[PDB]
């Protein structure tokens, strides 16, 4: 690949939820404007354009599937995954896998119910689509790596973590050590940096990478030491209305830092 990061298999992409206030047609434009070549689309993202209020989900019709793939292709963007997916019924998991296959996705980011692991592993093997288990703060099943490893250790190598480095730190965990624990079991990331936690505010929000407390450089050093290869999805939950400038500075810091260590 042309950049150092790209050479080493580190693919920066957009997590479409960062642009949930806009239709997917606009999210593609912004993703292209940012020079990003990959996108992970959240389930339910409204399409806009000539599709109006039709959404990107596993019930999307065949014509629209192909039209969306062409629009993305036309803007230099590959749709690599979809998520974060939470199944409403167990029977829906096979529908999601068929949709991922038809859309030619590499992975589904999700939070499977603990009781559906045999089913999900089986489908992942059958369909050749990776499963990247997202962590979020408690209450939840995968909020720390050892809970993910309790669920997936010994199963298909196609199963792993969608590493949300922010949410691990929001749980008081050493996020760099969370990456370390998940060596060989990280499929993709929800890469972000976050502000220090203020006693009197409930949320510590996302900030431009390199300005927060997550030590983006050290996390990249750890990902280097593991020989990680995959997609770093930009999930930027701040300045929702006008976040492209901030995201541009995020991307700049990432390439600058990856160039320094690669």
PDB file of C-alpha atoms in Angstrom:
ATOM      1  CA  UNK A   1       0.000   0.000   0.000  1.00  0.00           C
ATOM      2  CA  UNK A   2       1.208   3.591  -0.462  1.00  0.00           C
ATOM      3  CA  UNK A   3       1.302   5.010   3.119  1.00  0.00           C
ATOM      4  CA  UNK A   4       3.535   3.416   5.770  1.00  0.00           C
ATOM      5  CA  UNK A   5       0.407   2.440   7.707  1.00  0.00           C
ATOM      6  CA  UNK A   6      -1.122   0.928   4.544  1.00  0.00           C
ATOM      7  CA  UNK A   7       2.127  -1.018   3.820  1.00  0.00           C
ATOM      8  CA  UNK A   8       1.828  -2.531   7.307  1.00  0.00           C
ATOM      9  CA  UNK A   9      -1.816  -3.478   6.932  1.00  0.00           C
ATOM     10  CA  UNK A  10      -3.252  -0.649   9.055  1.00  0.00           C
ATOM     11  CA  UNK A  11      -6.363   0.586   7.246  1.00  0.00           C
ATOM     12  CA  UNK A  12      -8.032   3.785   8.462  1.00  0.00           C
ATOM     13  CA  UNK A  13     -11.759   3.901   7.846  1.00  0.00           C
ATOM     14  CA  UNK A  14     -14.819   5.781   8.962  1.00  0.00           C
ATOM     15  CA  UNK A  15     -17.346   4.445  11.457  1.00  0.00           C
ATOM     16  CA  UNK A  16     -20.575   5.863   9.953  1.00  0.00           C
ATOM     17  CA  UNK A  17     -22.140   6.484  13.371  1.00  0.00           C
ATOM     18  CA  UNK A  18     -19.823   9.544  13.626  1.00  0.00           C
ATOM     19  CA  UNK A  19     -22.136  11.000  10.909  1.00  0.00           C
ATOM     20  CA  UNK A  20     -25.446   9.520  12.189  1.00  0.00           C
ATOM     21  CA  UNK A  21     -26.990  13.013  11.954  1.00  0.00           C
ATOM     22  CA  UNK A  22     -26.625  12.831   8.187  1.00  0.00           C
ATOM     23  CA  UNK A  23     -27.752  10.440   5.492  1.00  0.00           C
ATOM     24  CA  UNK A  24     -25.263   7.838   4.345  1.00  0.00           C
ATOM     25  CA  UNK A  25     -24.896   9.640   0.996  1.00  0.00           C
ATOM     26  CA  UNK A  26     -23.441  12.602   2.971  1.00  0.00           C
ATOM     27  CA  UNK A  27     -21.353  10.275   5.202  1.00  0.00           C
ATOM     28  CA  UNK A  28     -19.749   8.838   2.024  1.00  0.00           C
ATOM     29  CA  UNK A  29     -18.961  12.380   0.791  1.00  0.00           C
ATOM     30  CA  UNK A  30     -17.341  13.312   4.118  1.00  0.00           C
ATOM     31  CA  UNK A  31     -15.403  10.008   4.219  1.00  0.00           C
ATOM     32  CA  UNK A  32     -14.168  10.760   0.694  1.00  0.00           C
ATOM     33  CA  UNK A  33     -13.392  14.377   1.685  1.00  0.00           C
ATOM     34  CA  UNK A  34     -11.246  12.985   4.510  1.00  0.00           C
ATOM     35  CA  UNK A  35      -9.285  10.797   2.050  1.00  0.00           C
ATOM     36  CA  UNK A  36     -10.413   7.603   3.784  1.00  0.00           C
ATOM     37  CA  UNK A  37     -10.842   4.484   1.723  1.00  0.00           C
ATOM     38  CA  UNK A  38     -12.964   2.301   4.068  1.00  0.00           C
ATOM     39  CA  UNK A  39     -16.240   2.562   5.889  1.00  0.00           C
ATOM     40  CA  UNK A  40     -18.045   0.562   8.578  1.00  0.00           C
ATOM     41  CA  UNK A  41     -21.757   1.369   8.359  1.00  0.00           C
ATOM     42  CA  UNK A  42     -23.998   1.298  11.446  1.00  0.00           C
ATOM     43  CA  UNK A  43     -27.276  -0.729  11.137  1.00  0.00           C
ATOM     44  CA  UNK A  44     -30.126   1.691  10.618  1.00  0.00           C
ATOM     45  CA  UNK A  45     -28.086   4.479   8.959  1.00  0.00           C
ATOM     46  CA  UNK A  46     -30.618   6.362   6.730  1.00  0.00           C
ATOM     47  CA  UNK A  47     -29.545   6.259   3.098  1.00  0.00           C
ATOM     48  CA  UNK A  48     -30.824   9.634   1.838  1.00  0.00           C
ATOM     49  CA  UNK A  49     -30.496  10.601  -1.853  1.00  0.00           C
ATOM     50  CA  UNK A  50     -33.043   8.840  -4.042  1.00  0.00           C
ATOM     51  CA  UNK A  51     -33.544   6.171  -1.304  1.00  0.00           C
ATOM     52  CA  UNK A  52     -34.888   8.681   1.219  1.00  0.00           C
ATOM     53  CA  UNK A  53     -35.660   7.016   4.538  1.00  0.00           C
ATOM     54  CA  UNK A  54     -34.646   3.519   3.518  1.00  0.00           C
ATOM     55  CA  UNK A  55     -31.937   2.322   6.009  1.00  0.00           C
ATOM     56  CA  UNK A  56     -28.688   0.338   5.723  1.00  0.00           C
ATOM     57  CA  UNK A  57     -29.606  -2.950   7.417  1.00  0.00           C
ATOM     58  CA  UNK A  58     -29.942  -6.710   6.681  1.00  0.00           C
ATOM     59  CA  UNK A  59     -33.358  -6.255   5.052  1.00  0.00           C
ATOM     60  CA  UNK A  60     -31.909  -3.935   2.390  1.00  0.00           C
ATOM     61  CA  UNK A  61     -33.172  -4.931  -1.098  1.00  0.00           C
ATOM     62  CA  UNK A  62     -30.846  -6.252  -3.793  1.00  0.00           C
ATOM     63  CA  UNK A  63     -31.063  -3.250  -6.114  1.00  0.00           C
ATOM     64  CA  UNK A  64     -30.143  -0.789  -3.332  1.00  0.00           C
ATOM     65  CA  UNK A  65     -27.326  -3.020  -2.104  1.00  0.00           C
ATOM     66  CA  UNK A  66     -25.641  -2.834  -5.483  1.00  0.00           C
ATOM     67  CA  UNK A  67     -26.380   0.869  -5.987  1.00  0.00           C
ATOM     68  CA  UNK A  68     -24.773   1.615  -2.592  1.00  0.00           C
ATOM     69  CA  UNK A  69     -21.758  -0.526  -3.447  1.00  0.00           C
ATOM     70  CA  UNK A  70     -21.395   1.418  -6.727  1.00  0.00           C
ATOM     71  CA  UNK A  71     -21.709   4.850  -5.068  1.00  0.00           C
ATOM     72  CA  UNK A  72     -19.039   3.833  -2.541  1.00  0.00           C
ATOM     73  CA  UNK A  73     -16.803   2.428  -5.323  1.00  0.00           C
ATOM     74  CA  UNK A  74     -17.281   5.634  -7.322  1.00  0.00           C
ATOM     75  CA  UNK A  75     -15.892   7.652  -4.338  1.00  0.00           C
ATOM     76  CA  UNK A  76     -12.868   5.382  -3.809  1.00  0.00           C
ATOM     77  CA  UNK A  77     -14.449   3.755  -0.711  1.00  0.00           C
ATOM     78  CA  UNK A  78     -14.864   0.088   0.204  1.00  0.00           C
ATOM     79  CA  UNK A  79     -17.659  -0.871   2.675  1.00  0.00           C
ATOM     80  CA  UNK A  80     -15.642  -3.211   4.992  1.00  0.00           C
ATOM     81  CA  UNK A  81     -18.135  -3.887   7.709  1.00  0.00           C
ATOM     82  CA  UNK A  82     -21.310  -3.148   9.474  1.00  0.00           C
ATOM     83  CA  UNK A  83     -22.123  -2.608  13.163  1.00  0.00           C
ATOM     84  CA  UNK A  84     -22.388  -2.350  16.056  1.00  0.00           C
ATOM     85  CA  UNK A  85     -25.054  -5.019  15.601  1.00  0.00           C
ATOM     86  CA  UNK A  86     -27.254  -6.338  18.400  1.00  0.00           C
ATOM     87  CA  UNK A  87     -29.546  -9.142  17.315  1.00  0.00           C
ATOM     88  CA  UNK A  88     -33.152  -8.785  18.312  1.00  0.00           C
ATOM     89  CA  UNK A  89     -33.842 -12.520  17.748  1.00  0.00           C
ATOM     90  CA  UNK A  90     -31.349 -15.428  17.364  1.00  0.00           C
ATOM     91  CA  UNK A  91     -32.949 -16.268  14.015  1.00  0.00           C
ATOM     92  CA  UNK A  92     -31.797 -12.892  12.705  1.00  0.00           C
ATOM     93  CA  UNK A  93     -28.104 -13.877  12.884  1.00  0.00           C
ATOM     94  CA  UNK A  94     -28.302 -15.962   9.659  1.00  0.00           C
ATOM     95  CA  UNK A  95     -30.019 -13.004   7.863  1.00  0.00           C
ATOM     96  CA  UNK A  96     -27.146 -10.672   8.965  1.00  0.00           C
ATOM     97  CA  UNK A  97     -24.519 -13.123   7.649  1.00  0.00           C
ATOM     98  CA  UNK A  98     -26.279 -13.511   4.291  1.00  0.00           C
ATOM     99  CA  UNK A  99     -26.452  -9.693   4.050  1.00  0.00           C
ATOM    100  CA  UNK A 100     -22.737  -9.349   4.939  1.00  0.00           C
ATOM    101  CA  UNK A 101     -21.853 -11.938   2.286  1.00  0.00           C
ATOM    102  CA  UNK A 102     -23.975 -10.243  -0.403  1.00  0.00           C
ATOM    103  CA  UNK A 103     -22.414  -6.840   0.513  1.00  0.00           C
ATOM    104  CA  UNK A 104     -18.944  -8.473   0.443  1.00  0.00           C
ATOM    105  CA  UNK A 105     -18.032  -7.295   3.956  1.00  0.00           C
ATOM    106  CA  UNK A 106     -14.956  -8.469   5.843  1.00  0.00           C
ATOM    107  CA  UNK A 107     -16.596  -8.269   9.294  1.00  0.00           C
ATOM    108  CA  UNK A 108     -19.674  -7.585  11.465  1.00  0.00           C
ATOM    109  CA  UNK A 109     -19.026  -5.566  14.636  1.00  0.00           C
ATOM    110  CA  UNK A 110     -21.429  -6.699  17.273  1.00  0.00           C
ATOM    111  CA  UNK A 111     -22.283  -7.661  20.801  1.00  0.00           C
ATOM    112  CA  UNK A 112     -23.687 -11.210  20.596  1.00  0.00           C
ATOM    113  CA  UNK A 113     -25.710 -12.648  23.419  1.00  0.00           C
ATOM    114  CA  UNK A 114     -23.573 -15.010  25.498  1.00  0.00           C
ATOM    115  CA  UNK A 115     -26.000 -17.866  24.629  1.00  0.00           C
ATOM    116  CA  UNK A 116     -25.589 -17.444  20.828  1.00  0.00           C
ATOM    117  CA  UNK A 117     -21.859 -18.223  20.513  1.00  0.00           C
ATOM    118  CA  UNK A 118     -22.164 -21.686  18.894  1.00  0.00           C
ATOM    119  CA  UNK A 119     -24.580 -20.275  16.317  1.00  0.00           C
ATOM    120  CA  UNK A 120     -22.375 -17.195  15.562  1.00  0.00           C
ATOM    121  CA  UNK A 121     -19.140 -19.198  15.310  1.00  0.00           C
ATOM    122  CA  UNK A 122     -20.833 -21.690  12.986  1.00  0.00           C
ATOM    123  CA  UNK A 123     -22.114 -18.916  10.654  1.00  0.00           C
ATOM    124  CA  UNK A 124     -18.808 -17.096  10.688  1.00  0.00           C
ATOM    125  CA  UNK A 125     -17.126 -20.307   9.465  1.00  0.00           C
ATOM    126  CA  UNK A 126     -19.910 -21.058   6.949  1.00  0.00           C
ATOM    127  CA  UNK A 127     -19.939 -17.531   5.465  1.00  0.00           C
ATOM    128  CA  UNK A 128     -16.293 -16.610   5.871  1.00  0.00           C
ATOM    129  CA  UNK A 129     -17.185 -13.277   7.608  1.00  0.00           C
ATOM    130  CA  UNK A 130     -15.289 -12.172  10.697  1.00  0.00           C
ATOM    131  CA  UNK A 131     -16.909 -11.296  13.995  1.00  0.00           C
ATOM    132  CA  UNK A 132     -15.516  -8.341  15.924  1.00  0.00           C
ATOM    133  CA  UNK A 133     -17.010  -8.057  19.408  1.00  0.00           C
ATOM    134  CA  UNK A 134     -17.492  -4.499  20.547  1.00  0.00           C
ATOM    135  CA  UNK A 135     -16.906  -3.502  24.176  1.00  0.00           C
ATOM    136  CA  UNK A 136     -18.851  -0.789  25.905  1.00  0.00           C
ATOM    137  CA  UNK A 137     -19.105   0.349  29.572  1.00  0.00           C
ATOM    138  CA  UNK A 138     -21.047  -1.648  32.203  1.00  0.00           C
ATOM    139  CA  UNK A 139     -23.683  -2.957  32.309  1.00  0.00           C
ATOM    140  CA  UNK A 140     -22.613  -5.155  29.361  1.00  0.00           C
ATOM    141  CA  UNK A 141     -21.100  -8.594  28.644  1.00  0.00           C
ATOM    142  CA  UNK A 142     -17.783  -7.603  27.006  1.00  0.00           C
ATOM    143  CA  UNK A 143     -16.747  -4.554  28.995  1.00  0.00           C
ATOM    144  CA  UNK A 144     -13.298  -6.001  29.804  1.00  0.00           C
ATOM    145  CA  UNK A 145     -11.150  -8.380  27.621  1.00  0.00           C
ATOM    146  CA  UNK A 146     -11.258 -11.380  29.973  1.00  0.00           C
ATOM    147  CA  UNK A 147     -15.054 -11.518  29.484  1.00  0.00           C
ATOM    148  CA  UNK A 148     -14.561 -11.621  25.693  1.00  0.00           C
ATOM    149  CA  UNK A 149     -11.849 -14.289  26.064  1.00  0.00           C
ATOM    150  CA  UNK A 150     -14.196 -16.350  28.371  1.00  0.00           C
ATOM    151  CA  UNK A 151     -16.720 -16.338  25.476  1.00  0.00           C
ATOM    152  CA  UNK A 152     -14.484 -16.868  22.444  1.00  0.00           C
ATOM    153  CA  UNK A 153     -11.201 -18.550  23.585  1.00  0.00           C
ATOM    154  CA  UNK A 154     -10.793 -21.773  21.620  1.00  0.00           C
ATOM    155  CA  UNK A 155     -13.240 -20.814  18.895  1.00  0.00           C
ATOM    156  CA  UNK A 156     -12.584 -19.847  15.272  1.00  0.00           C
ATOM    157  CA  UNK A 157      -9.782 -17.383  14.585  1.00  0.00           C
ATOM    158  CA  UNK A 158     -12.476 -15.437  12.651  1.00  0.00           C
ATOM    159  CA  UNK A 159     -13.798 -14.281  16.039  1.00  0.00           C
ATOM    160  CA  UNK A 160     -12.189 -11.433  17.935  1.00  0.00           C
ATOM    161  CA  UNK A 161     -12.469  -7.962  19.427  1.00  0.00           C
ATOM    162  CA  UNK A 162     -13.725  -4.689  17.964  1.00  0.00           C
ATOM    163  CA  UNK A 163     -11.409  -2.869  20.314  1.00  0.00           C
ATOM    164  CA  UNK A 164     -13.007   0.345  21.664  1.00  0.00           C
ATOM    165  CA  UNK A 165     -10.011   1.803  23.406  1.00  0.00           C
ATOM    166  CA  UNK A 166     -12.015   4.642  24.810  1.00  0.00           C
ATOM    167  CA  UNK A 167     -14.638   2.514  26.519  1.00  0.00           C
ATOM    168  CA  UNK A 168     -11.980   0.390  28.237  1.00  0.00           C
ATOM    169  CA  UNK A 169     -10.434   3.511  29.783  1.00  0.00           C
ATOM    170  CA  UNK A 170     -13.921   4.782  30.764  1.00  0.00           C
ATOM    171  CA  UNK A 171     -14.127   1.549  32.823  1.00  0.00           C
ATOM    172  CA  UNK A 172     -10.841   2.331  34.623  1.00  0.00           C
ATOM    173  CA  UNK A 173      -8.868  -0.185  32.632  1.00  0.00           C
ATOM    174  CA  UNK A 174      -5.387   0.261  31.271  1.00  0.00           C
ATOM    175  CA  UNK A 175      -6.306   0.373  27.597  1.00  0.00           C
ATOM    176  CA  UNK A 176      -2.842  -0.471  26.375  1.00  0.00           C
ATOM    177  CA  UNK A 177      -2.912  -3.632  28.531  1.00  0.00           C
ATOM    178  CA  UNK A 178      -6.403  -4.428  27.205  1.00  0.00           C
ATOM    179  CA  UNK A 179      -4.823  -4.507  23.660  1.00  0.00           C
ATOM    180  CA  UNK A 180      -1.979  -6.677  25.001  1.00  0.00           C
ATOM    181  CA  UNK A 181      -4.490  -9.214  26.464  1.00  0.00           C
ATOM    182  CA  UNK A 182      -6.284  -9.373  23.130  1.00  0.00           C
ATOM    183  CA  UNK A 183      -3.189 -10.147  20.958  1.00  0.00           C
ATOM    184  CA  UNK A 184      -4.150 -12.429  18.117  1.00  0.00           C
ATOM    185  CA  UNK A 185      -7.818 -11.764  18.875  1.00  0.00           C
ATOM    186  CA  UNK A 186      -8.293  -8.133  17.669  1.00  0.00           C
ATOM    187  CA  UNK A 187     -10.272  -8.041  14.343  1.00  0.00           C
ATOM    188  CA  UNK A 188     -10.808  -4.271  14.125  1.00  0.00           C
ATOM    189  CA  UNK A 189     -10.878  -1.111  16.265  1.00  0.00           C
ATOM    190  CA  UNK A 190     -13.094   1.836  17.213  1.00  0.00           C
ATOM    191  CA  UNK A 191     -10.075   4.085  17.561  1.00  0.00           C
ATOM    192  CA  UNK A 192     -10.464   7.293  19.519  1.00  0.00           C
ATOM    193  CA  UNK A 193      -8.789   9.474  22.154  1.00  0.00           C
ATOM    194  CA  UNK A 194     -10.659  10.949  25.109  1.00  0.00           C
ATOM    195  CA  UNK A 195     -10.536  13.824  27.619  1.00  0.00           C
ATOM    196  CA  UNK A 196      -9.649  13.316  31.264  1.00  0.00           C
ATOM    197  CA  UNK A 197     -12.617  12.386  33.428  1.00  0.00           C
ATOM    198  CA  UNK A 198     -14.073  15.276  35.351  1.00  0.00           C
ATOM    199  CA  UNK A 199     -15.535  14.457  38.769  1.00  0.00           C
ATOM    200  CA  UNK A 200     -18.656  16.509  38.075  1.00  0.00           C
ATOM    201  CA  UNK A 201     -19.379  15.455  34.476  1.00  0.00           C
ATOM    202  CA  UNK A 202     -20.777  12.029  33.542  1.00  0.00           C
ATOM    203  CA  UNK A 203     -19.058  11.667  30.198  1.00  0.00           C
ATOM    204  CA  UNK A 204     -15.474  12.159  29.208  1.00  0.00           C
ATOM    205  CA  UNK A 205     -15.901  12.966  25.507  1.00  0.00           C
ATOM    206  CA  UNK A 206     -13.772  12.040  22.506  1.00  0.00           C
ATOM    207  CA  UNK A 207     -11.051  14.516  21.466  1.00  0.00           C
ATOM    208  CA  UNK A 208      -8.669  14.952  18.537  1.00  0.00           C
ATOM    209  CA  UNK A 209      -6.136  12.089  18.620  1.00  0.00           C
ATOM    210  CA  UNK A 210      -2.935  13.023  20.396  1.00  0.00           C
ATOM    211  CA  UNK A 211      -4.733  15.586  22.612  1.00  0.00           C
ATOM    212  CA  UNK A 212      -6.345  13.152  25.068  1.00  0.00           C
ATOM    213  CA  UNK A 213      -5.249  10.737  27.774  1.00  0.00           C
ATOM    214  CA  UNK A 214      -5.304   7.420  25.846  1.00  0.00           C
ATOM    215  CA  UNK A 215      -1.667   7.578  24.708  1.00  0.00           C
ATOM    216  CA  UNK A 216      -2.511   6.926  21.010  1.00  0.00           C
ATOM    217  CA  UNK A 217       1.246   6.658  20.359  1.00  0.00           C
ATOM    218  CA  UNK A 218       1.691   3.868  22.947  1.00  0.00           C
ATOM    219  CA  UNK A 219      -1.389   2.065  21.748  1.00  0.00           C
ATOM    220  CA  UNK A 220       0.058   2.130  18.222  1.00  0.00           C
ATOM    221  CA  UNK A 221       3.420   0.856  19.604  1.00  0.00           C
ATOM    222  CA  UNK A 222       1.552  -2.072  21.236  1.00  0.00           C
ATOM    223  CA  UNK A 223      -0.381  -2.806  17.983  1.00  0.00           C
ATOM    224  CA  UNK A 224       2.972  -2.750  16.163  1.00  0.00           C
ATOM    225  CA  UNK A 225       4.560  -5.207  18.661  1.00  0.00           C
ATOM    226  CA  UNK A 226       1.621  -7.622  18.068  1.00  0.00           C
ATOM    227  CA  UNK A 227       1.904  -7.351  14.231  1.00  0.00           C
ATOM    228  CA  UNK A 228      -1.771  -6.267  14.150  1.00  0.00           C
ATOM    229  CA  UNK A 229      -3.297  -5.984  10.662  1.00  0.00           C
ATOM    230  CA  UNK A 230      -6.761  -4.578  10.144  1.00  0.00           C
ATOM    231  CA  UNK A 231      -9.170  -1.683  10.114  1.00  0.00           C
ATOM    232  CA  UNK A 232      -9.024   1.242  12.488  1.00  0.00           C
ATOM    233  CA  UNK A 233     -12.516   2.673  12.349  1.00  0.00           C
ATOM    234  CA  UNK A 234     -12.855   6.370  13.309  1.00  0.00           C
ATOM    235  CA  UNK A 235     -15.700   6.643  15.817  1.00  0.00           C
ATOM    236  CA  UNK A 236     -15.687  10.326  16.816  1.00  0.00           C
ATOM    237  CA  UNK A 237     -18.531  11.025  19.281  1.00  0.00           C
ATOM    238  CA  UNK A 238     -18.183  14.802  19.597  1.00  0.00           C
ATOM    239  CA  UNK A 239     -18.878  17.996  17.567  1.00  0.00           C
ATOM    240  CA  UNK A 240     -21.434  15.771  15.736  1.00  0.00           C
ATOM    241  CA  UNK A 241     -22.621  18.604  13.471  1.00  0.00           C
ATOM    242  CA  UNK A 242     -19.249  19.778  12.237  1.00  0.00           C
ATOM    243  CA  UNK A 243     -16.631  17.098  12.962  1.00  0.00           C
ATOM    244  CA  UNK A 244     -14.715  16.829   9.665  1.00  0.00           C
ATOM    245  CA  UNK A 245     -12.064  19.405  10.683  1.00  0.00           C
ATOM    246  CA  UNK A 246     -11.412  17.570  13.976  1.00  0.00           C
ATOM    247  CA  UNK A 247     -11.305  14.182  12.191  1.00  0.00           C
ATOM    248  CA  UNK A 248      -8.804  15.614   9.629  1.00  0.00           C
ATOM    249  CA  UNK A 249      -6.474  16.441  12.527  1.00  0.00           C
ATOM    250  CA  UNK A 250      -7.021  12.941  13.978  1.00  0.00           C
ATOM    251  CA  UNK A 251      -5.996  11.354  10.673  1.00  0.00           C
ATOM    252  CA  UNK A 252      -2.961  13.659  10.420  1.00  0.00           C
ATOM    253  CA  UNK A 253      -1.743  12.630  13.865  1.00  0.00           C
ATOM    254  CA  UNK A 254      -2.207   8.940  13.066  1.00  0.00           C
ATOM    255  CA  UNK A 255      -0.141   9.057   9.909  1.00  0.00           C
ATOM    256  CA  UNK A 256       2.469  11.208  11.592  1.00  0.00           C
ATOM    257  CA  UNK A 257       2.741   8.791  14.521  1.00  0.00           C
ATOM    258  CA  UNK A 258       2.599   5.618  12.336  1.00  0.00           C
ATOM    259  CA  UNK A 259       5.360   7.080  10.151  1.00  0.00           C
ATOM    260  CA  UNK A 260       7.482   7.606  13.271  1.00  0.00           C
ATOM    261  CA  UNK A 261       7.155   3.972  14.394  1.00  0.00           C
ATOM    262  CA  UNK A 262       7.016   2.184  10.950  1.00  0.00           C
TER     263      UNK A 262
END
